[PDB]
């Protein structure tokens, strides 16, 4: 220690400098953390966590391909009617027809004209029905080729309905209203009102009773400053609603910004109406994810009319940074990465719920909700005002449709909901008193009782003349405020629409609602208790159906063989005896190994999007989640599936509930798993750096041969000396020697299409010796060939030789890159002197897989033609096999293609920029499942995957003679 200190003093070295800097930075951490804990104790955990920024420009999703979704919807409806899903023209079919009309154009008209003229009405009544309905829809769409898209709601209005069972069971249903069955009748009832709302050629406004308040009306501010029902404004609003119900209301050239429009809300229905009407809607979501984006894509594919664009963006209305960023993004030019849009309407319906938060409980969550619902709304309108003023816009105001509550503290226990809703009413006066009237127009919609706890009593509230609305009805009322006449009225002066349904006229609404809920709840418990006690009395007095569960029955899915007359009707009559079946090639079998297991499981995931019982059980078996057991198990004898690890019995019913999440998480396109690629972590990619040694490294003991090799390499830059004690050698590198130090590269392709985790060749029955000998690609090919022969029904491959010579069965499949694992072995593991099998080179060949197939399963001496076509090697294989069979050197051929995913191939594809950058995808908010999006605006690279695909083709004559299934004709 003293010698070290002397040397440090001589060197002017401060050994304590690092510690002093550390203590200073620790004090800085302490004081900054003290500031953070003060701010956390002040605003609260909820507020601080909830002000986290969520919006980003790169994460916005645009939907504008209504031209495509129109054809998609038309085909869906066409096939549904043909198959008999839709026997009658119900309101859902009418709504879909309206959407098709809204997206109609000349190309669409030609599409439907072809599909209906080509329809053969003689194929039963369903084809005649679809032909007639298609003719009607063609006639309707031809009329509205040039007409603007219109929001027209045709759903049957539904009222509340609560029933109490004999056993005290509460069931709520949205049964159709008997009196009202159209939107026009809804508006007529709205104008008519009821007894409660009364006080002491011809439009619907004419039908209003005298001295009565319609359920939906507009209020005018009296000179005293109070808002009262106004006949003129109410009549204007109801006339607009009547026109929107009968003709439909267009929202062309209308740019809307709607927040809080998630599924199951009023904003979602308003968004659907805007998309129907043709508006450019920016919908903001606080739950941005694949589920929400898929929901909004479905909404747009269903309702997005011609000229409409849906911009789904992540957004936190509780953070002013998100508010400013969203408004900037909307108003900024497309060249600057914005939208270049100017908002015509704003619908800030975003709110977070509050239950059981009274005055004493107002806390961080309540303050944050108040921010979202009042303060950040005001900031958002201020931001829109600032953008419009900066761009010098005075004559294009944005209509802020404010969500207002008729009740301000009537129910209580809702935190600051009433405070936010009531403070939103200052905007009516602020519009006049401040200098933003020309940029914004205030439309306070007082939303009434809407039905999405609060539903069981809706029927009881309606028995006194009060009107309760559904989400669709409330959205219709809100969209009635976006009509041109109401927009012009808002521009004249701010408007207060009361859509409360007469809920204000009931005295003591909170207490009456509580009484209704108490009555229903008391009746339900009394009935349930009485039923339980009667049941127990019956059981004790009189003393003391087997349910059958589905079990997995996996089918090979051989082609359906129809009767001969049926199969002959479709084909031409002159085909009989015309074709040389020896010259006709038929795919008799097929199979694959891929990210979704076998061909069956992949097909189920492709077509239906989820696994059935058979598919899920097959996936669990493939992934090793469930193993089969037959014999004694925990004493009792069990025969069936068991968990592979715990060995506990698992029923096919429980297989889904126990392994669906695991299968989905470890199947398909997903983050690269190093355990499946030999500890390959793309986030930590090993490289080595050449450096020149600057000092003689310390000796390290090495073998005699190893020391000799080091000396041969480094020449005079290393020194090897024998140790007489044990005969080993010490190797001493000198200055100037060459050294390789590992270094790690952060690589940006993290997601790949990987065969499901737990996929093992032993599961299919390949021996461990074969697994050690051959590459994983070869194992995939062997499994694919076996499964393809199983699909062809050829359980024994030698069964082919009963019909063809050994020279007449070929294998024309191949690979684009072959045994990349063996190539990596020979090029890197051998370079590093790791243990590598001496035959890794013959395992690396592209034809090695076909060789192993032939010399493990087939034994054929027929033609062998291994192609390379990169991504087209499988069509190459099909072409080569077809030509082999037609030339006749083969009669059966194994065609297809295979390739593997590995570190080096992935990295070189990334260098090429052919694959998609996963970091950019994460920046855009894309999940691994949605990385691969062919034929989309945002596609920026292919999604690399691995596996094999094999088909057994043969002559048609031979396929008929062996009696193998025929899946198709090449």
């Amino acid at each position: 220690r003293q010698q070290l200190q002397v040397l440090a003093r001589y060197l002017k070295m401060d050994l304590d400098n690092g510690e002093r800097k550390f203590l200073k930075e620790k004090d800085t951490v302490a004081e900054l953390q003290a500031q953070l804990d003060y701010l956390n104790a002040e605003l609260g955990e909820f507020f601080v966590n909830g002000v986290a920024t969520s919006f980003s420009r790169k994460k916005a999703r645009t939907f504008d391909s209504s031209w495509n979704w129109a054809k998609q919807s038309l085909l869906s409806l066409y096939f549904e009617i043909i198959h008999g899903v839709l026997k009658n023209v119900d309101r859902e079919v009418v709504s879909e027809a309206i959407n098709i009309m809204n997206r109609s154009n000349d190309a669409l008209i030609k599409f439907m004209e072809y599909h209906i003229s080509n329809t053969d009405e003689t194929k039963g009544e369903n084809y005649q029905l679809v032909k007639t309905l298609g003719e009607q829809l063609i006639e309707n769409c031809k009329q509205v080729l040039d007409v603007d898209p219109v929001y027209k709601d045709v759903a049957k209005p539904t009222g509340p309905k609560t029933a109490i069972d004999k056993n005290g069971n509460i069931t709520y249903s949205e049964e159709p209203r008997e009196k009202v069955r159209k939107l026009s009748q809804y508006v007529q009832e709205m104008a008519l009102g009821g007894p409660i709302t009364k006080e002491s050629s011809k439009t619907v406004s004419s039908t209003i009773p005298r001295e009565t308040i319609p359920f939906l009306h507009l209020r005018k501010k009296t000179p005293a400053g109070d808002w009262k029902y106004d006949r003129q404004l109410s009549s204007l609003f109801l006339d607009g609603l009547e026109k929107a119900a009968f003709n439909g209301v267009t929202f062309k050239d209308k740019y809307v910004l709607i927040t809080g429009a998630g599924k199951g809300s009023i904003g979602a229905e308003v968004l659907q109406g805007l998309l129907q009407g043709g508006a450019k809607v920016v919908v903001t979501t606080s739950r941005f994810s694949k589920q929400v984006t898929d929901y909004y894509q479905s909404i747009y594919a269903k309702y997005g009319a011609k000229g409409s664009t849906l911009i789904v963006v992540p957004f936190n209305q509780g953070s002013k940074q998100d508010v400013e960023a969203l408004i900037e993004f909307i108003y900024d030019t497309e060249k600057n990465g914005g939208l270049g849009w100017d908002l015509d309407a704003i619908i800030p319906f975003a709110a977070i719920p509050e239950q059981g938060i009274e005055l004493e409980h107002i806390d961080s969550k309540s303050e944050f909700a108040h921010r979202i619902m009042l303060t950040n709304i005001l900031r958002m309108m201020g931001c829109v005002k600032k953008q419009k003023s900066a761009r010098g816009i005075e004559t294009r105001p944005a209509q802020v449709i404010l969500p207002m509550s008729p009740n301000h503290g009537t129910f209580g226990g809702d935190g600051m909901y009433s405070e936010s809703k009531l403070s939103l009413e200052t905007l009516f006066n602020r519009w006049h008193s401040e200098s933003w009237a020309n940029q914004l127009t205030v439309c306070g919609a007082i939303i009434g009782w809407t039905r999405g706890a609060n539903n069981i009593i809706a029927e009881g509230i309606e028995k006194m003349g009060v009107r309760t609305f559904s989400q669709k009805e409330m959205a219709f009322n809100l969209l009635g405020l976006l009509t041109p006449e109401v927009v012009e009225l808002c521009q004249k002066s701010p408007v207060m629409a009361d859509l409360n349904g007469g809920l204000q006229f009931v005295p003591e609404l909170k207490e009456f609602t509580a009484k209704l809920r108490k009555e229903l709840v008391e009746t339900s418990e009394v009935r349930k208790a009485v039923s339980i006690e009667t049941a127990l009395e019956h059981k004790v007095v009189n003393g003391n159906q087997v349910e059958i569960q589905p079990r997995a029955n996996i089918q090979l899915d051989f082609p359906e063989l129809k009767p001969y007359k049926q199969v002959k009707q479709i084909a031409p009559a002159e085909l009989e005896g015309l074709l040389d079946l020896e010259r006709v090639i038929v795919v008799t079998g097929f199979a694959e190994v891929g990210p979704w297991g076998s061909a069956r499981t992949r097909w189920e995931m492709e077509a239906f999007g989820e696994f059935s019982l058979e598919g899920c059980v097959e996936m669990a078996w493939i992934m090793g989640f469930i193993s089969y057991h037959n014999g004694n198990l925990k004493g009792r004898p069990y025969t069936g599936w068991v968990d592979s690890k715990t060995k506990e019995p698992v029923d096919d019913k429980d297989v889904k509930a126990k392994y669906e999440t695991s299968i989905l998480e470890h199947s398909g396109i997903r983050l690269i798993e190093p355990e499946l690629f030999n500890g390959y972590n793309p986030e930590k990619k090993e490289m080595i750096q050449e450096v020149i040694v600057e000092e003689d490294l310390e000796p390290f003991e090495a073998s005699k041969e190893t020391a000799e090799q080091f000396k041969h390499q480094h020449g005079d830059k290393v020194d090897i000396f024998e140790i007489p004690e044990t005969g080993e050698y010490s190797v001493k590198l000198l200055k100037g020697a060459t050294l390789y130090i590992p270094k790690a590269l952060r690589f940006d392709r993290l997601v790949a299409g990987q065969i499901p985790t737990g996929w093992n060749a032993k599961t299919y029955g390949i021996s461990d010796d074969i697994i050690s000998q051959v590459d994983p690609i070869t194992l995939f090919v062997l499994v694919s060939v076996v499964e393809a022969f199983i699909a062809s029904g050829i359980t024994d491959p030698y069964e082919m030789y009963k019909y063809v010579h050994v020279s007449e069965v070929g294998n024309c499949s191949g690979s684009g890159m072959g045994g990349v694992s063996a190539l990596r072995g020979m090029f890197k593991d051998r370079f590093k002197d790791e243990p590598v099998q001496n035959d890794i080179l013959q395992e690396s060949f592209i034809n090695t897989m076909s060789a192993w197939v032939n010399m493990l399963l087939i034994s054929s001496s027929g033609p062998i033609k291994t192609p390379v076509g990169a991504c087209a090697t499988s069509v190459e294989s099909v072409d080569i096999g077809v030509e082999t069979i037609l030339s006749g050197k083969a009669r059966i051929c194994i065609v297809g293609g295979y390739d593997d995913f590995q570190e080096e191939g992935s990295f070189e594809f990334g260098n090429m920029k052919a694959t998609s950058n996963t970091l950019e995808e994460f920046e855009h908010g894309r999940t691994p499942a949605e990385m691969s999006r062919p034929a989309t605006t945002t596609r920026n690279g292919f999604m690399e995957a691995q596996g094999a695909g094999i088909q057994i083709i043969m002559q048609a004559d031979l396929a008929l003679k062996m009696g193998v299934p025929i899946y198709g004709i090449v």
């Binding site: 198959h83 090697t873 090449v970």
Partner: protein, 145 residues
């Protein structure tokens, strides 16, 4: 994607396809990804399944079809599965590096059975039924063991 849509559209134009009859495009790599050679084989398996089931899977990742693809009036880009009442033929198209363009056409197997006699078809159906039963027992035995 642009080149392939253009190629299919040009094929459909030159071969005189009826206007208003777009070919329904199936994109399978949205789900299975892109293998460097198993691709066309997976698409053939999917095409055979489409033929036999009459079901056309939709590109569920097709969030928004590219506007540039609207010009190809003979191509449709579904996003959800379609329960079609029968698929006659399927055109599998692949494009590998090195200018490896490739096309295949898979016709429905039922058009083959119209080229044979009633007795031949009946004996073929009987043989296929027996072979399907044998294959089922073999497959389930091999799966469990």
């Amino acid at each position: 994607d642009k080149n392939e849509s253009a190629t299919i559209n040009e094929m459909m134009k030159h071969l005189g396809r009826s206007e208003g009859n777009p070919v329904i495009g199936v994109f399978q790599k949205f789900l299975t990804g892109h293998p460097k050679g198993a691709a066309g084989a997976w698409m053939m398996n999917g095409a055979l399944q489409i033929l036999n089931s009459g079901i056309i899977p939709g590109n569920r990742n097709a969030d928004n079809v590219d506007k540039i693809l609207e010009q190809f009036e003979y191509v449709l880009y579904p996003s959800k599965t379609l329960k079609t009442d029968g698929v006659r033929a399927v055109s599998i198209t692949s494009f590998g590096f090195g200018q490896k363009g490739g096309q295949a056409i898979v016709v429905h197997p039922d058009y083959l059975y119209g080229a044979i006699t009633e007795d031949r078809y009946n004996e073929y159906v009987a043989k296929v039924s027996a072979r399907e039963k044998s294959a089922y027992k073999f497959f389930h035995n091999g799966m469990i063991y």
